[PDB]
Design a protein around this nucleic acid. Structure first.
Lengths: 56, 103, 48, 110, 117, 150, 142
RNA sequence: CCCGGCGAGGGGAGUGAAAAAGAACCUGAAACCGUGUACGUACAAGCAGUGGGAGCACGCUUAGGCGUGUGACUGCGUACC
RNA sequence: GUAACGGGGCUAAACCAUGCACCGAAGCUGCGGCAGCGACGCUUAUGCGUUGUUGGGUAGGGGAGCGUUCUGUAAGCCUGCGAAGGUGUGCUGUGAGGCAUGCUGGAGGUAUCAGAAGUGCGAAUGCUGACAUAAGUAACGAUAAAGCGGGUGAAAAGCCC
């Protein structure tokens, strides 16, 4: 549409409060190694349930 | 002990050891302030008196400061009519400190 | 030196209105000319 | 001991960065550094490289230790805009503005 | 003689936005809303000098009333007796002994109550 | 403003300035509404007011003991170091020198001296005469000023 | 300087149980509203609700006196359907039996917010089953 | 010398009187966005101001009921041209 | 949507006959400050003492003051022994304003008083700049679509192969 007036800067901040980037709740490590993870996906070494993935 | 005296047409409460303010006196710092215009000293109870300015009472004081306050502002204004005017005032006073008052 | 101790003759100085400056000033809007009509506006039309 | 890393001319509008800056105020470097690892977004790697630079000069030089580091300040200010003309209705030749941000990370042990 | 125009207004401004500290949003930072806000302020401010006193003066009557009804007399009968009774200037601002240390004020209400006819 | 009469225009009554001409003073820059005109502020000067104001300052020069009247003041030459060593000996500093005779040998002097200056008594300059610490004078100038106020 | 005056930290309240069982709706009501503001006691403050914590012992059987009963039908328009809306006088006593006294003292409190701050001290319950037994309530006669 | 792709940007080390002169460098507002502290926002409402004010930090309160800043709460109250 | 006392409430807390009281405005008045000016006294170039009606005010007239740019005393004199300029606060005046002061600053500044003027923006649906706003809103330009393997590369659904 348009607007009435130029709005206050507290409004602009309430309007963004739910759209803000949300916490990850910590991280994963392997249940069976000291290799770092990406949670419930497969690492660069194929590690989750062994085999091999992502040979870049 | 608390007591009441008249600054003028207004009546004022004050205690012992109290520094209190009123409108400016002629009486200076190196002089004595004293009030015979005491309306009661409220003793242990309400007193039942008719004739005020109790003859068996005084509030002795002294001046402790003569100054001026902060600047207060007065705006007189009427809209769409192009009417705006301003005045200031700081107002004089005297501080007195109360030593007197019998129980 | 005795210069810069001078002053205008007794009562000679009016100073006179500057106009068009502030709104708590007394002078401001219209100029001392009032609302609308030929004499409130800039100089034109009619002879004396 | 305090360190500034800046990146000027970085490829971002400033609102998308201010969403993240206000999240990590007072957060300490390690918790934010995880939060950005488990944010996949390209923006979150963009801030990581400057956040990582902030940590690295603390790990050397004038800093000493980087566990007790905390992100004391985090802010972004208006970079140089490049101007392009947007095709639009009835041949309106209106401006679209291509933003950069001058993004500042400050870390200290304080 | 080129005059600069406005280096005086920079101080008049700073005097208004300083007087408009504590005001909300644009009021503490925009001269235009600051000035309005300032002018309105001093009207209430001079108004409320008198108006507080007329307002408190209601509270004074209502604490004397409560004292009086406990002594089974109404406030208007209690003034109308004290008039009839000899002297006392009195004052409505007097009865702190309404609110606190309520053991007192009785002697004064009881004189006025007696003196009524 | 020359070099263009263009109308920026694009009508009036459409959410913008009346936009009459590109040279009107309020159009940001290039020439302003009341810019300065040549001033030359000199008058007639009224002879009878002038000479009687000079009688007031002239009277004030004896009452403050400022009229020195050095007798037949001159130097051999217009050299600043010979006049200055005279003035230092006579113990005078920062003086209005009045020549009675407009003689070139005093009149072309004093330039090297910071606060010292020479004029002649013929139509004496009244804004000078009310400034400076002292008036040097000769007895020849004093005769011709009483006769100029006559 | 100014005379001293009362402050929010001092307010006593105390607990009162008011027998209403001999009484009438509006002379109960306007007394009730006076105590509930704190205008029965010395306020000496224009902005602190002083007042009592008020237990009504019953008030479920309170006669209004006269025919105003059968025309007190509580008009409201919450957001639906043609007609003005109402509730009988009988609803106010058969269901939420307090409600005849409640939206009678309600209208005696000021505007929106302050009148909510005054109100939160009154309770009536269903009637004659009251639960401030342990506080030992001060009885009060009208 | 540190970080990053050979990048951009900043810091350290070292220069100068000064970099709170770091290359767009003169001292530098206001709009501008953000940090840090205090204290506030979940019985909670309108020109956001005025009057009354718990509470709380700082000021040896010279404790003499105050100053400063904020302020639950609430009586009253309709911007300028 | 009660909504014809303003409402709650009052079938007497109503209303009517008589009569008394209270509250209730910068009104009536007292305290303390003050403006201008009549009378009277001192007795003036300048005022102060007593007494007094007085002081809501636009359009509009008139009087007074300020600062900004500039001259003149200022060819003097103060200056890195910390100038102008910025800025937060305290003080002070009826107000405009002025003054003090920590911060900041690395060269400049000054009255009294008279005199000249491009002489204070917030409005002209005013002109220009820096830069805020609605907004994390809308956009993906004939859907001549694409895949997945490898590679330059630091990184690829779109590139190169």
């Amino acid at each position: 549409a348009v607007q009435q007036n130029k709005p206050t800067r507290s409004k602009r901040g309430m309007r963004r409060s739910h759209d803000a980037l949300t916490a990850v709740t910590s991280l994963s490590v392997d249940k069976t190694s000291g290799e770092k993870h990406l949670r419930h996906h497969i690492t660069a070494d194929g590690y989750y349930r062994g085999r091999k993935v992502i040979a870049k | 002990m608390y007591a009441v005296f008249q600054s003028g047409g207004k009546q004022h409460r004050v205690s012992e050891g109290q520094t209190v303010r009123l409108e400016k006196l002629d009486i200076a710092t190196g002089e004595t302030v004293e009030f015979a215009e005491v309306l009661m000293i409220a003793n242990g109870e309400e007193v039942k008196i008719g004739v005020p300015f109790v003859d068996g009472g005084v509030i002795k004081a002294e001046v402790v400061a003569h100054g001026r306050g902060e600047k207060v502002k007065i705006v007189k204004f009427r809209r769409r009519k192009h009417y705006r005017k301003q005045q200031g005032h700081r107002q004089w006073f005297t501080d007195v400190k109360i030593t007197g008052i019998s129980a | 030196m005795r210069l810069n101790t001078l002053s205008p003759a007794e009562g000679s100085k009016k100073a006179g209105k500057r106009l068009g400056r502030g709104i708590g000033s007394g002078l401001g809007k219209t100029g001392g000319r009032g609302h609308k009509g030929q004499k409130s506006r800039s100089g034109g039309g009619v002879r004396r | 001991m305090e360190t500034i890393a800046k990146h000027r001319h970085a490829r971002s509008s400033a609102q998308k960065v201010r969403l993240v800056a206000d999240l990590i105020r007072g957060k300490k470097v390690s918790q934010a550094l995880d939060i950005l690892t488990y944010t996949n977004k390209k923006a979150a790697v963009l801030v990581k490289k400057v956040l990582e630079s902030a940590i690295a000069n603390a790990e050397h030089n004038d800093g000493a230790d980087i566990d007790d580091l905390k992100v004391t300040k985090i802010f972004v200010d208006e970079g140089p805009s490049m101007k392009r003309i947007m095709p639009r209705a009835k041949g309106r030749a209106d401006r679209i503005l291509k933003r950069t941000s001058h993004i500042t990370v400050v870390v200290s042990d304080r | 003689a080129r005059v600069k125009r406005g280096v005086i207004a920079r101080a008049r401004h700073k005097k208004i936005l300083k007087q408009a500290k504590g005001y909300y949003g644009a009021r503490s930072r925009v001269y235009r809303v600051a000035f309005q806000a300032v002018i309105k302020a001093g009207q209430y401010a001079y108004r409320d000098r008198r108006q507080r006193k007329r307002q408190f003066r209601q509270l004074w009557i209502a604490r004397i009333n409560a004292a009086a009804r406990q002594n089974g007399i109404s406030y208007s009968k209690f003034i109308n007796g004290l008039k009839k009774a000899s002297v006392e200037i009195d004052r409505k601002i007097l009865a702190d002994i309404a609110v606190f240390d309520k053991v007192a004020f009785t002697a004064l209400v009881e004189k006025a109550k007696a003196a009524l006819a | 403003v020359t070099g263009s009469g263009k109308k920026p225009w694009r009508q009036k009554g459409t959410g913008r300035a009346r936009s009459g001409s590109i040279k009107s003073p309020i159009w940001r820059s290039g020439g302003v509404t009341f810019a300065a005109r040549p001033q030359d502020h000199s008058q007639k000067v009224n002879k009878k007011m002038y000479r009687g104001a000079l009688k007031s300052i002239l009277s004030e020069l004896v009452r403050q003991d400022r009229l020195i009247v050095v007798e037949k003041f001159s130097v051999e030459a217009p050299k600043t170091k010979l006049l200055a060593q005279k003035l230092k000996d006579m113990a005078l500093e920062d003086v209005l020198i009045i020549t009675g005779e407009l003689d070139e040998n005093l009149f072309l002097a004093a330039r090297n001296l910071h606060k010292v200056d020479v004029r002649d008594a013929t139509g004496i300059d009244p804004v000078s005469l009310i400034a400076f610490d002292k008036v040097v004078m000769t007895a020849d100038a004093v005769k011709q000023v009483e006769e100029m106020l006559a | 300087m100014k005379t001293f005056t009362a402050k929010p930290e001092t307010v006593k309240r105390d607990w009162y149980v008011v027998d209403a069982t001999g009484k009438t709706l509006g002379r109960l009501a306007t007394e009730l509203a006076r105590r509930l503001r704190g205008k029965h006691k010395a306020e000496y403050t224009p902005h602190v609700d002083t007042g009592d914590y008020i237990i009504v012992l019953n008030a479920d059987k309170v006669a209004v006196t006269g025919n105003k009963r059968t025309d007190k039908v509580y008009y409201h328009h919450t957001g639906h359907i043609g007609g003005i809306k109402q509730a009988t006088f009988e609803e106010m006593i058969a269901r939420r039996p307090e409600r005849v006294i409640e939206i009678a003292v309600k209208g005696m409190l000021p505007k929106g917010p302050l009148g909510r701050a005054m109100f939160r001290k009154l309770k009536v319950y269903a009637g004659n089953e009251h639960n401030h037994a342990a506080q030992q309530p001060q009885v009060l006669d009208i």
